[PDB]
Amino acid sequence: MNLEAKKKVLRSFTYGLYVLTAKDGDEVAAGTVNWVTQASFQPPLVAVGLKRDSHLHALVERTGKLALMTLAHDQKAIAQDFFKPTVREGDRLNGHPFEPSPTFGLPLLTELPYWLEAEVRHLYPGGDHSLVVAEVVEAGVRREEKPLVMWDTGWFYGG
Known part of the structure; x- marks a missing residue:
């Protein structure tokens, strides 16, 4: 296949920027992630792509x-x-x-x-x-505001 095209197309995907956290006893982990999306309304499901070889995963x-x-x-x-x-x-x-x-x-x-x-x-x-x-x-809102869109940061993770 056209790998260069593949990279471009995948890089054309739009993402938000989020911080995911997890913990086990005193061990805590946090990381910025972008491969995120809601996956259902009822029940309320979210899908997060985490790298298999990572602390948070x-x-x-x-x-x-x-x-x-x-x-x-x-x-x-x-x-x-x-x-x-x-x-x-x-x-x-x-x-x-x-x-x-x-x-x-x-x-x-x-x-x-x-x-x-x-x-x-x-x-x-x-x-x-x-x-x-x-x-x-459970969920909470400290304040309302426009979220951070990855494209605006200049960063990326995909391709």
Whole structure:
């Protein structure tokens, strides 16, 4: 097939930027992700593509719990910090304050506008990633605002 065309077409996909978190005891993990989409209205399902060989994939697969926060249009700088390994210091992750989520107590970045807690229902491995399908069990809105669209950041993950 035309691999160059394939890369371009896949790179033409539009994505939002989110931060997914997970934890097991004192071990916590957070990372910026873009392969995300709702997958059902009833029940409320979301699908997140996580790299099989990654810290967050290991925690999410093993504990079956996760939290996801939507980054605001002006939070590129924050999204930037969660590309690196997660370093927890006090009630902060990579320099950003967080609070325990209301349901399972997963790390919640208090600066981000929207957040949700979800339980893993199915984890579908496929190639180098796995499609985690989880059911939203709680959600919260600190404030309303336009989300961060990946294209505007200049970054990308696809192709």
